Amino acid sequence: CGAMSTAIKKRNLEVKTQMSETIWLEPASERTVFLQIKNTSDKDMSGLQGKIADAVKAKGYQVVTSPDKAYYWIQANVLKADKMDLRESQGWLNRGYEGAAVGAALGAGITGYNSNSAGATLGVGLAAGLVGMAADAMVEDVNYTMITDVQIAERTKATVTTDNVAALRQGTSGAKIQTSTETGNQHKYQTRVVSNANKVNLKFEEAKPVLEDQLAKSIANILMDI
Amino acid sequence: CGAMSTAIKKRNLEVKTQMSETIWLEPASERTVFLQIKNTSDKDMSGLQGKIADAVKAKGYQVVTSPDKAYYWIQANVLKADKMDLRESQGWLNRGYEGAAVGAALGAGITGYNSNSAGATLGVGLAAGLVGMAADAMVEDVNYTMITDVQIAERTKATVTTDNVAALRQGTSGAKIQTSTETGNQHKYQTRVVSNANKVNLKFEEAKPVLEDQLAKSIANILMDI
Amino acid sequence: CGAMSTAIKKRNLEVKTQMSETIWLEPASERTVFLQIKNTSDKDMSGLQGKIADAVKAKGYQVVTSPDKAYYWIQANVLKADKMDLRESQGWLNRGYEGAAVGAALGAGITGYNSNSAGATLGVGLAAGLVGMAADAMVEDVNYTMITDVQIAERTKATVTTDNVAALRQGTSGAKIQTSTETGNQHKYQTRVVSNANKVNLKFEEAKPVLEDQLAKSIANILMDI
Amino acid sequence: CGAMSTAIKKRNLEVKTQMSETIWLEPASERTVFLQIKNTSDKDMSGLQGKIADAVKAKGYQVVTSPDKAYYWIQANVLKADKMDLRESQGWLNRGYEGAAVGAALGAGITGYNSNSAGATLGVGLAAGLVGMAADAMVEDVNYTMITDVQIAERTKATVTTDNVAALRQGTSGAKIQTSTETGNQHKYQTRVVSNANKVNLKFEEAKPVLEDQLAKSIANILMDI
Amino acid sequence: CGAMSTAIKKRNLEVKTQMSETIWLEPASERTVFLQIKNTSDKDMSGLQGKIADAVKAKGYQVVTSPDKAYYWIQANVLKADKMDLRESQGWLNRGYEGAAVGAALGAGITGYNSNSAGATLGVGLAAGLVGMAADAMVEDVNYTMITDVQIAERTKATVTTDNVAALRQGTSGAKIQTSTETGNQHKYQTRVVSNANKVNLKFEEAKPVLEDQLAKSIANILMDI
Amino acid sequence: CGAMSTAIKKRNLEVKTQMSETIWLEPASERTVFLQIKNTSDKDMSGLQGKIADAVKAKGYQVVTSPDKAYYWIQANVLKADKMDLRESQGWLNRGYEGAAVGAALGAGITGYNSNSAGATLGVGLAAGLVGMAADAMVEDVNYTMITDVQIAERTKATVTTDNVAALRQGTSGAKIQTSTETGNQHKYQTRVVSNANKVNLKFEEAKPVLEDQLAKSIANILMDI
Amino acid sequence: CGAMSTAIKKRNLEVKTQMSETIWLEPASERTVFLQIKNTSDKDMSGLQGKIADAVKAKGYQVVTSPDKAYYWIQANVLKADKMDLRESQGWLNRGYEGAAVGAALGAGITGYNSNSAGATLGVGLAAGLVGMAADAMVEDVNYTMITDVQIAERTKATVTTDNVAALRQGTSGAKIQTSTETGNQHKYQTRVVSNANKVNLKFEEAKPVLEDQLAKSIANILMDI
Amino acid sequence: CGAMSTAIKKRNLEVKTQMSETIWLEPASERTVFLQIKNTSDKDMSGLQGKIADAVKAKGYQVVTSPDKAYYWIQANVLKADKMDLRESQGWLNRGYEGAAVGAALGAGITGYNSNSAGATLGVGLAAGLVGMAADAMVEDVNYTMITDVQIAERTKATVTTDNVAALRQGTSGAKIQTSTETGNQHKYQTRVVSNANKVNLKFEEAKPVLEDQLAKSIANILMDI
Amino acid sequence: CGAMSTAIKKRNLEVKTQMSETIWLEPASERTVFLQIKNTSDKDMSGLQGKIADAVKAKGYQVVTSPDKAYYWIQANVLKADKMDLRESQGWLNRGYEGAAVGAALGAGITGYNSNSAGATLGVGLAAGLVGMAADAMVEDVNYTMITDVQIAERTKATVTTDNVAALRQGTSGAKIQTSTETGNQHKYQTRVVSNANKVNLKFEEAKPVLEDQLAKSIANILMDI
């Protein structure tokens, strides 16, 4: 019952995109944005940069190819992606014991009353039980989790001091501490977006365009309209 | 029994809006408000800005389109939205085992006494049990959770110093610390509003106007009347 | 049932590569990269350096053999690799008791009704039960976990101070603390990549080319295109 | 069933070598290495030093017998070694109760139907049960764990200050704190390697050459090729 | 079954010696060692000092009787020794209930079918059950644990400052703090060695020579060869 | 069964003496020791001082009666002693229920078949059960725990500053803090010795000479021979 | 069975006296002691002061009635005393249910076979069960716990500064902090003695002389002989 | 059985008085005491002040009515008093279910064999069961707990500084901190006394004189005799 | 049984008043008190101020209406009051299941033997069971908890500094810190009184006069008599 229940509940693709924290931007009249999209995950998001540019341009901004003449920077990295089956947390039922029991009972029942003979009701029941167990194992609640790191840069008139601190671990004994200081006129803020795609026997190709569309809109909505 | 019990209990739309903390504002005679509404969530709240303006104007304030000549700022961001089924926390009953048992017993019972024959009471019972299990899976206690970040700005005669501190994580080794200082005559306060919409098989389109109305009134009620 | 369920679920090779943290790099026009790939693990990844160079060159960079004339350094070390069987966490079922019970019942059942005689149904059942238990033990959900440490170096105009701190443990009594200070014009950042390969009775030779391909792309994608 | 299941699963020698942490070394053109290998454990690793020298020489380095004219030092100590039986964590089954039950049932069964007589089926069953329990106790999942401490020294142009701090515990009352300071031109880093050897009824002599080979390669791979 | 299972598993003497931490010594050309071995435990280790001297001399060092002309000091104290029975952690089975049940069943069984009479099968069964319970109690998994504190002294050219801090507890109210400072040219490091000897009904006299041999080699192996 | 099992296992006196921590003493040519032995416990250890003097003199030292002309001080206090029954941690079995059940069954069994009559088998069984319960209560695993505080003083050339800090609790409100400072040429170190004596129905008089002998040797072994 | 088991085990008075911590006193030739014994507990210890004086005088000291000409002070306070029944921690068995069951069964059994009649076996059984329950309630494992605070004063040549700190709690709002400083030539140390007296149905009058004798010896043994 | 067991065990009044901490007073020749006794509890302790004066005068002190000419102050406050039933922690048995079961069985048993008729055995049993349940509820293990705060003042020659610190909580926002400093020649110490009175169906009037007597003696015993 | 057991146990009104902490007041000859009683709770305590004045006047003090000429201030606020049913913590028994079972059994029993007929014993039993369940629900162990904050002010000659610190929370972002300093000659102390009133089906009107009387006496008893 668990296999078909999962199939009915998760019959439709469900995509959820959740931004971790709110980045507040001062009102301004500038409309130049520079984009820098990376993907260090093992899954394809090649269409993300184009969709972000379209969403940003639809809000009244102009996308420039050189970062020096851009008032805003949108830096995004699709950091990691994970795949898991939600049925695996239900216990031993996900293994296929329930599917085997239903198949075995159906095979013996359909043979025990119709042409019972002797031994035939065991061979058919075993074959049906094996098929039932196999069919249970082929149904999984596939869930795709994606993590995207977003960095937004805004130009400012105030002097901004950037202190780079890095504790480069060297072994089990210690680390190499690197320090430097630079000044500029740019404020940088970071935020994280978590994406989820869920469907029965979901293939990432089907969920890829929807994940890109929702992720692009969420990142582009940090900027104010016009 | 769980499916119909959920349907009866959650037959009506229930919307709850809860502000996290109270923002205290000094009494004043100014009535100029600037609005800035964002939506980084994956759900539509396009009518929120208009409803906030109507609620603010109904309290005696004047909405201005330029932030420089506004005594008050209302900055709101619909940060994230989540959907979950409350029946999923009830255990294995939500899977559909209870629905299958009721359907199987009804199918066998209606056939065991009326035209029992042989084998017929099993085929009808299995079909009825499958339908009963399927009907249980199609009933869910849909709950929508929404998080909205609110920032309120108030002009003041005192000098306000803003120190921007950002620890931009760079990897597993360290971070880039950004610091800057600016002065102004504006006080900013933050608060959070949590919204909930609950109904059986709820679609967000039905709950969207109610969520917007309650959220707009809650945010606009931070300001005093007149 | 657990043995064949594992075989069906894990019938295909699944490789997952996940970068731990995002390294942000400033936009630049330099395209010289120096590579330094190490492997202190007990498994072969000899093709990793060549695949990283191909992926880096495909993005518009030029690989140089001398570190002094390289704007970027990519230092990677395949630190450790582990092998485990996921079925071992299922309990006593992984031992082979379930396989023995199925084999014993099948052996006695196929003999109890056909040529029952006396004592024969026990010898066949014991032999079939032993074979069933043996076949269960030969099926394992092999999972390979690999840890890779990545260090990225970027040239900068700012003066960078490196303080080496090492607490070399000397016994149970204390340690020898080593300190030194050097200056340079290079920023170094660290990150970690976790790789997983899963299949039934998986041999590392089959998963080696896929692990190298995914790891090379993930590391090379830290750099921006062109 | 546990005894033969362990024998089948652990029928082949499995050796795992895992370095705890990554030691990063700056690129250089020096190729002189000094070796210093110790063994304070109770197990023989006499061939480790020779295998490290061969692996180091195969990577293009020259091994020198005097530490003063060596750019690199490789100091390794096989600190401790432990032996344990993995079956001991399975519970009372490892004691031999399961083996006794199988032997007792087989002895009584083979006698209860063939020449039952009286009392004979108890003497044979008891003898077979004792043999079955004894055979279970002679099968163990032997696992050898080895800990190796590694210290790597690299010459540098920077001045290195070494502060020796030792809190020599004197009783339950206090300690004798020893402090000293020396300067030099050598950086030292520490790391740890954990080795595991697993097989049914494993003897350390069989696993000794494999442990030495994997440990030597792991330590020598800290150095870059050529 | 537990008694004979323990006898078979622990039929051979097993001695394990594990050094807690690694003491690193700089390479040097000195070969003078001074020994100072103490034993505050309740067990005899009179042969430890002689075996340490033999192991040290076999590595190329010269043992001197006066500490002032020794480059190295080896100070060892056999601090404490403990004896425990590993069967005591198995529960009530170690008491002898299992042995009584086997003896009682054997006594009644051997009499119930052969010369049953009346009352005789109870007297023999009770006597056999008592003997079986007694034999179970005489079998124990004897484990000897030994703790040895090791202090190694090395001459150095640097000035070494020793600060003696002792918080001598005086009652429940406070303590007497003693402080002093001395200077010297000797570095001292501490480490701990844990020894284990396990056998069925083990007597410490049998395990004494093996414990001394392994402990002496472990301590002497802190020094480099030649 | 628990009563006789305890009697067999603990039939012999077992004395364990364990020093808590190691006190390290510098090599020296002095051989004058002053003894000061106290006993604040409730048990007799009158022979401890004489045995310590004999053990110290057997190692080449000379015992002096005046502390001013002694290079070493040995101050020991037998602080506390405790007595407990190890069978009390076994549960309700130590109460005597098991002994009553065995006695009641034996009384009824020996009467139920031989001269059964009526009512006689109950009076004899009750009397035998009461005796069996009483005999169980008279068997206890007596364990004696003793704590001894040891303070060792050594003359030194360095100036030793003793700061006496005492927080004399005055009530629930506060305390009276006492502070003083003195200088001297004597180092004091503290350690603790834990003694255990275990036997069935053990009387402290039997274990007293063995406890004194082991305690005296352990304390005297802090000093080096000759 | 619990009632008589407790009576047999605790048939003899057992008194345990345990000093919490060791007070170390420097060797000296003075023999003047001043005593000050208090008793704030609810139990009589009137003979404690006399027994302490006798024990102190037996060790060679002279007791003086004026504190100004005494080198040593012994200040003791019997702080508190508690009484508890150890059977109360055994559960519901201590209530008397076990005693009622034994009495009820004995009453019905002695009447069911001898002059059974009708109804008589219930009246006798109820009366015997009530008596059995009552007798169980009259047996208790009485344990007396006593806490004694000890303060020892020793004259010294060093200047001793006493800082009195008292945080006198004034309500739920705060406290009144009292501070003062005095100088003197006397060192004070504190320790605690815990006394236990255990017997079945123990009356404190029987345990009073033994508690006084053990407490007096323990306190007087802080001083060295002669 | 629980009701009568409680009645037998707690048939006599038991009063326990325990002082929390020891207040140490320097020996002196002054004998003037000023008393100040308060009672903020809800129970009557009107006789406490008179009994303290009698106990103090019996020890050789003189009670004065004006605090300025008193060397000692005894300030006591009976802070709070609580009443609880110890049977309430036994579970549902204290409710009266056990009493109802005994009464119901007795009523049915006395009627089932004597004049059974029909229905009569139910009416009598119900009435007897109700009476039995009612009688169980009227028996309670009444325990009275009393807390007394004691403050003792002693004149001194040293200057005493009293710093009054009070954090008067003002709301959920903050507090009003009050600070002041005064000097005097009086030391104040605080301690707490806990009193317990236990009996079946105890009325506080019966326990009042005993509580006063024990409390008065405990407080007066802080002072030394004469 | 739970309903009537609660009715019998709680048949009488029980009022408990407990002061949290003791406020110590210096002896003085002043007798002017100013009262200020507030009640922010939802329950009526209108008679509290009059009863406090009567209790204060009965102790020899004079109540003044102007705070400036009062040596003592008594400020009290009845902060909050809560009502709860103690039967609600007993579990499902408080719901009324036990009452329904008793009523159903009584209804069926009184009809099953007298005029059994058919179906009549079910209608009467259901009606009686419903009445029994209803009667159980109408019985509750009503407990009223009241919290009273007390502030006592005392005039003093010392200068008292009051620092007002208030952290007025402004939102989720921060707070507004208010600070001020004033000087005066008045000490203020705070304490808390907890009041409890318990009875079956208790109405607050019945417990109001008793709560006022006990609360007034407790607060007035902080002051010394005369």
Author numbering:
A (entry chain H), B (entry chain I), C (entry chain G), D (entry chain F), E (entry chain E), F (entry chain D), ...: 22 to 247
Publication excerpt:
In incompatibility group F (IncF) plasmids surface exclusion is mediated by the outer membrane protein TraT. TraT is an outer membrane (OM) lipoprotein that is exposed at the cell surface. TraS blocks DNA transfer following mating pair formation (“entry exclusion”) whilst TraT acts at an earlier stage to inhibit mating pair formation (“surface exclusion”). TraT is a hollow homodecamer shaped like a chef’s hat.
Overproduced, affinity-tagged TraT was solubilised using the detergent dodecylmaltoside (DDM) and purified. Cryo-electron microscopy (cryo-EM) of the TraT preparation revealed homogeneous ~100 Å wide particles from which we were able to solve a 2 Å resolution structure of the TraT complex. The overall structure resembles a chef’s hat in shape but with an internal cavity extending along the entire long axis. The bottom of the ‘hat’ inserts into the OM bilayer as judged from the position of the detergent micelle and from the local surface hydrophobicity. The TraT monomer comprises three distinct elements: a globular core domain, two transmembrane α-helices (TMHs), and a long β-hairpin. The globular core domain is composed of two α-helices packed against a predominantly antiparallel five-stranded β-sheet from which the TMHs and the β-hairpin extend. The membrane-spanning portion of each TraT subunit extends from the core domain and consists of two TMHs connected by a short, periplasmic loop of four amino acids (S136-A139). Notably, the TMHs from neighboring TraT subunits do not pack tightly against each other, rendering them relatively mobile and poorly resolved. In the native cellular environment, the transmembrane end of the TraT cavity is almost certainly sealed by a lipid plug and so does not form an open channel across the OM. However, the structural data show that TraT is actually an integral OM protein in which a large globular domain associates with the membrane bilayer through a pair of TMHs in each subunit.
